[PDB]
Amino acid sequence: MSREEVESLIQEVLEVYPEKARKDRNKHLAVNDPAVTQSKKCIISNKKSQPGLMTIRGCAYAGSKGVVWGPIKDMIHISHGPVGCGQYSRAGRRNYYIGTTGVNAFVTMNFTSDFQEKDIVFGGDKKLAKLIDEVETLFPLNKGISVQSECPIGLIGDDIESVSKVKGAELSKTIVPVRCEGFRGVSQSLGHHIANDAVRDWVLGKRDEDTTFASTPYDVAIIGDYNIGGDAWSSRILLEEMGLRCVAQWSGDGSISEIELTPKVKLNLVHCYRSMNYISRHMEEKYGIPWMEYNFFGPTKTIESLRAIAAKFDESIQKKCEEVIAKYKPEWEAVVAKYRPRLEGKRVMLYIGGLRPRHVIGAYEDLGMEVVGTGYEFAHNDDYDRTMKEMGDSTLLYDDVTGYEFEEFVKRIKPDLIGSGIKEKFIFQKMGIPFREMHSWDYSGPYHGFDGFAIFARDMDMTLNNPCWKKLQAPWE
Amino acid sequence: MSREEVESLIQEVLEVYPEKARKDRNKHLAVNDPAVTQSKKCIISNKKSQPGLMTIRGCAYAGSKGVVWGPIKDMIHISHGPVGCGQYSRAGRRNYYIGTTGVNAFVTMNFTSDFQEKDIVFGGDKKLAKLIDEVETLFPLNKGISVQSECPIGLIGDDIESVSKVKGAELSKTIVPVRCEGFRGVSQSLGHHIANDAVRDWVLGKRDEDTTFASTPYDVAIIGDYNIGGDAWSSRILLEEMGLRCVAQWSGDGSISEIELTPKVKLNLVHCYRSMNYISRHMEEKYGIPWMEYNFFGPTKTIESLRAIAAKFDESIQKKCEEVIAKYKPEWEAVVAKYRPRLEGKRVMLYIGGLRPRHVIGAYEDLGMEVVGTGYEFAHNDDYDRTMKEMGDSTLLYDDVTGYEFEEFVKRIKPDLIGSGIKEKFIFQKMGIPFREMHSWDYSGPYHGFDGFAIFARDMDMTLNNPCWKKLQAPWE
Amino acid sequence: SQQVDKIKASYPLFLDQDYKDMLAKKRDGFEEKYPQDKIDEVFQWTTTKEYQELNFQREALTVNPAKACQPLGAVLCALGFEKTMPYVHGSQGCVAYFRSYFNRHFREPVSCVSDSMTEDAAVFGGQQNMKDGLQNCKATYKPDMIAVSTTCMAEVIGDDLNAFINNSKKEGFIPDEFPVPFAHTPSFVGSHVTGWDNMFEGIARYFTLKSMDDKVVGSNKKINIVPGFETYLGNFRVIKRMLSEMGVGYSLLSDPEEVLDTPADGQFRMYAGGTTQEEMKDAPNALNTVLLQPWHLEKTKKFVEGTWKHEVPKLNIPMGLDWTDEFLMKVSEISGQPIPASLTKERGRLVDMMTDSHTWLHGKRFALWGDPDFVMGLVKFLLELGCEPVHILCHNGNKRWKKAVDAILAASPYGKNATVYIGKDLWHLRSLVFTDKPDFMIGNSYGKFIQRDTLHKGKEFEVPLIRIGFPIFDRHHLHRSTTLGYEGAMQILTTLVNSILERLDEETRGMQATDYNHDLVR
Amino acid sequence: SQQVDKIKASYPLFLDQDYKDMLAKKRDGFEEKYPQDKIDEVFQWTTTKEYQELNFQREALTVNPAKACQPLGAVLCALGFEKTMPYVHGSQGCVAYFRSYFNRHFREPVSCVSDSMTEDAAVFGGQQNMKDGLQNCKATYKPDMIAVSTTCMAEVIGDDLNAFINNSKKEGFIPDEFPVPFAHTPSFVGSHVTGWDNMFEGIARYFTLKSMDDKVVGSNKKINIVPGFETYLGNFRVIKRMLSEMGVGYSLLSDPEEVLDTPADGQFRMYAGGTTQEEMKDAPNALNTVLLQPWHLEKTKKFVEGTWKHEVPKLNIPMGLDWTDEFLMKVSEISGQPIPASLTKERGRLVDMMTDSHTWLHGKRFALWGDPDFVMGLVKFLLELGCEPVHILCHNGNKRWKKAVDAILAASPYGKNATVYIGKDLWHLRSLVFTDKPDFMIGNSYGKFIQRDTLHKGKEFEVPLIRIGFPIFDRHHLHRSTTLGYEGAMQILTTLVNSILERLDEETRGMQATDYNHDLVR
Ligand code: ICS
Ligand code: CLF
Ligand code: CLF
Ligand SMILES: [Fe+3]
């Protein structure tokens, strides 16, 4: 509110930085004007972080192994390198799946080459081949192997592509080498791009000549939904209620056969544009499959997306969509009637990764809650182009915010609720401000769809209005 | 050995008492002489305790409600009076049973009249009748009710016999009034006697005119085994393997129908003479049923008892007895070979209620383990007559020993292990002497029979040779 | 049969096929057991609301009570004084039961004596028993003080404790200077906490009633602390520690903390620590007296206000966050000492843990029982955490306490679905948790059977038990815990949140069925 | 579907019939899943001894490790100093993962910065990154000290930390007097404890190497304490408390307890407590230095003996009765202070608890894992309790430590059936607990999955997990516990005995089947 004070706050916050750091950071903070369609004139993104400023961004390995390849349940993913990277990323992301872990599913397990000094000095391609043999011996029901490279693999002269080719020819198994070394790029976005390229080059085209799959005019594939807390499932039950058939979902609860069957669908429904736009566009160019973005956060966005998707098919699909909307109307109406009075008028600040900082605005507004500030760790300029129209006037936008910047912004704006990751949760809890984890749903959820909206509203109500926030000050002080 | 210093120790322990207390307590301590079969001239028992000397004895309510009537699973036992007595005795004794608690079994439950001031002043007969009405309403599958009197019932002049008669006639239900007030007698022994008299007067003769029960020449009834940790089951399996049919079990895991069928058996096998000799003699006089005492503590006593019992029947029973002994010989021989080298030579001091201080001696001697001191809370002089020949020469015998007396005796004798109740366990553990609970088997067992002997030996070894007993002295002290 | 390398105790020895066949033969032959279908039908009926309506119509029958009799509390109070022997005038079976109860809960020696009254005393009274017992106890166990309570037998007979002790003193059975306080503790009135109150009032009246001429309020610059019936050593320890941090001179009366936690170093100690007679005599010189558990210390409050002329503060039990703050500020006001920074940091850490666990704690439904002060403090703490108390049971509660608890519940939106029950036993609570199922129970060990019953209806109907209170018999060393102050609140919150997480982990351990929610991070 | 009154999260919402049908259709239509009988056969095969033989032949594949990389330990060490910023020279993903790991374990803010080296630095080095990062960190977060560790990227490209920091000081990016200690922490060498050791050695060398001329051993009359990689705040607290009771002057180096336990009172504190620079400078003047975890403080020991000339005692970790006694006696001998009576009483109380719980503790079989010092202390305490360790796993252990643990096992008859494994991961331990079933596991949160696998074989084959170690993610506030000293031994004993009792209660809750052994008193 009152744009000039927001600019004054930005200047006051930037006053502490050195000249180079302040010049760089001035470009990544902006005041929203909804009429602006080109975000390059106000905010800059997808650049390197300033050293020593305590950024929140991850690495390309997190973007590829932790986000894209990890949810694939029937595949075994080898963290090629030292032990740390696979260990810190093991089961940290709630990409839900159905399977028997250790036999035919391996999502929550940590496979690594566990590099030692001799591996660094002399390379680890022979170790990689021996590891692949051991994996084949001890996990016979796996349907594929991916090799996710960590930093030393890129640094030393290792050639994992030739090893993957030789071993895949020898054992007749799909082995996908991913060069997702953490020093590449500036964030997880390059990891997304590298993982998409690997999927395109090694997995997607296996069934190009296969025509044994029976296709229907209602074949769609969910792209960029990773089943956080079951989110994708909560989406799927709606799409099948509309009369459509979901052949595949990428990549939460996903199987390699689903990915290989994806080029046979009629329509691609992309939830996370940021992480899967590469493969969606490639599929459009090569197979002629149209793709479209949708939003299932909140009843309004869900209804709009359902109608837009139904508009792509015949009359029966549209009638079924209307039936689904009518069936689910009373439930979310009751949820709103129960929870909006306790949440109306509250102000929220968000700082999340590439998609959610703009996707969940509608759900908050459905509860009578208003977003004062939003930002991204690693989004590109098109994400901000969408965000500027999705956000309100004179609100704050921040790209790759530092801990000091975010703390100062929160201290001045004083929001009622903050949605961010685990690395700000306790910082802002000690400040006396309710916090919701917007990556893992605070180990709750799902939040997608009509079923997820009730859980979302309940969680926001339970955290915002908890009595604990009234007891931070001692009565004698 | 060394009787002289034992008498010197007795005098030294006694010198601190007042004159009357010392004169009384001198009669209850003795030095064993195995040639003596008349223990009256050597020890005095079954007398009231000296006031203010911290005795271990209980009351008649504990002897009747807690010991005899309580194990009967299909009956409901009302602790008539104030709330304390049944609450302290609820599920404190491990008389095991099979049933659905609260529906057809009620052992671990506490039923009480919860006397208030108005009940004390104006009596509780009408309250007792209303309680019986409510018990019938809320527990329809109960097969009988007993009313165990507490001290104010006997003190205020409540006539529970008339109420029991009227309500039993009205409901066609067995209601047994037991005048087991705690001020009667000097210990639990009078509780045993009163409970046996109640069983005789109200329960035993109910099927005297009924002859529908098919009888066999091999019918026996276990009397005085309360299934402490499954002891009675481990005895019954041996009895059934030998070829006898066990009709009744008094009273652990017992049912009122079994008690009613008891006068139809051919032999009574009495384990606890102290608590059940009254009913055994009554059954022998009225129905002509012979009874015999047996011991299933340790392999030697078990084999002797099995042979003696088989001697009461035909040749097939004796053949089956030999078969059972031969079958079970290797198991207890292996137990002996495993545990006797770890326990040989250790000296034990015992103090239990009325049967076990002399019954468990054989099992201890089976492991090369010597009993140097034994005593009873409430035994009679016949129990001491039986005990005199089972103890070693110049061993200490104590009746109704005080806490100070037992502490001084243990301090001087310094036994390697003590077997007593919960009220001495921690006292002697803090002095650094291993302790075994010989009432509840330290929540272990069973100890009866061949199966129980292994558990007994394992428990003695695990407590005697525990490393914790070598750490009581700090290295710097 | 037994294998010498793997010896089986009763469980699972009696699950062997031979024992199973033996038990089946026994039941089929001589038990005359009801058919299993009838048993299942009766159990299902007992789980219904009609059975609950019949159950709550009880007037004469008590099933599984949640209280004890007065002399148990009297003995617990007597154990809190230095070199003091608890002496119960009456029957010895009561003393045996008291000692067994306290031994099982504390896993420690408990010393108490009886004068062993019999039918002869039922006819002529127990004056001779009193004289002989006092002489014998003093000669044998050498106490500095003998604190006398009564059993129901002596109360019904009508023995005069004062006259008996005076006649013992006059005839030379005990010295005239030997302190023998006494209290009448009838078992048909109140409960164990009432006995604690009566014994403490008797001791205080013995030591202070006739020496008030030279007493000036506030002379010794201390504050008296009366804890009441207390079975957690950590509570005594935390009260003393908090008062020491504030730099406040204090005198804790009836401190049994030392004698219930003696070390195992090779010697037995009958007596250890405890409030001295000098402290009891100097108590009227204190600035004020604070009662930690006011709802069972009413007679003590009346004596302290009417004789010591102390203005006893209106303070709740220092449990949870708000009431601990109120206790701290009241103590600061009385003593004049400011609250130190360390206690403020401890409170902040408690608030931090509350913020950390609020998401898992929110909305959970609880059925709790215990003593009045502990129950109301626990309800207050649950309301502070956003939890929902549903069934609040207090067998030894009264109507004024119920009104106070209802007032507490009305002040919180989370107390909307809560009902307070006084005079009800654990069978009532079993009906309540079958008909209105909560998420958890909080109570003593007796609740375990209830859990069993719930599990018999189904895994989806099972109500897990959380062991907080007295007595706890099936777990070891829980009596060392703390429930008062910020430390007690921390321990209680940790126990609750980890019980919730353990239940969640158990329900999501089914592979390929429910393990999709078996998250590493919670 | 959702009901507004009773909203269901993922569990048990996805157990609804419509979701079940949807998942069945998805699997049967597009997943191309193996038949369930094949899955059962493969799982049963993985539970066999032949599969264990195949599993232990692994030489190039690691499955579910139980260790981390050095910079995590370096960051934990750096966090223990006053107003010190951990600074990791390398890539930012490492710092993100470190902060997330420590946030999930401690539930507290973790401060750590990186210079965000990218593909450009992969051929030029990170000198400019170091200069700009040091300037930015000092300007923004205002630390009194910056402690620099390295990621594997800078280790492989071989960046020279000393030259980079000297050049940063030379060109005026940060002041010449600003303390900037550094250490190389390669992730492909050792584990996180090695990183802790390297960071502590670097800091000590920075503060004491060049000013040893004026130092005199024993002049300040204090004892230096180096705790090592420690994730229990109660351990620091108990070490301080025990040293304070003895009246022994001490200096705890790298003390992070305050910064990891800040209160929630309306403000965020980035720094709190910690070892001061003056204490580090004055450390060589102490009488001696005591290393709490000697098996990962070898380089620190070498520096302290070689340079400070302190005669470092050969002490084990102060875990369990005997090693706590030895630590106390050595401290008393060094400082000349007698051991006070309070510690003797605490030891006696621990012995009393051991005597009380020995019957349930005896003969139980445990598979345990963690760090070397913690693992060997736990093994020693288990042997003291009469328990049998069977599978002892230490992923980051070495052959000398294995020899020491074997010597410890050989001195007790309860260690007869124990095998020690070094370099093995949790898949090996899963095979071991399937083929040689213990009664319980002791380890971190990663053990939970193993428990699930055992429950998939059957309820009779399930091995419950007991959460002691690092990290613990699925329970709240267990990081406040204690494992050192008599208090830690008491806590561990209580946890073990009560876990055994809960397992027994669960096994005997079946009505009319196993509830004959559902004892109220245990
Ligand atoms: S993939 Fe991306 S950071 Fe699109 S790397 Fe990140 S499970 Fe975020 S805003 Mo964690 S671009 Fe998904 C994301 Fe969004 S891990 Fe999840 S919540 S919708
Ligand atoms: S940016 Fe990313 S997470 Fe960092 S290393 Fe690089 S791929 Fe990995 Fe794993 S091992 Fe440890 S944490 Fe690093 S320093 Fe060597
Ligand atoms: S000797 Fe025996 S146990 Fe004693 S009372 Fe008498 S029958 Fe009973 Fe129950 S209520 Fe309490 S404990 Fe007594 S004092 Fe009144
Ligand atoms: Fe104890």
Ligand SMILES: [Fe+3]
């Ligand atoms: Fe926290």
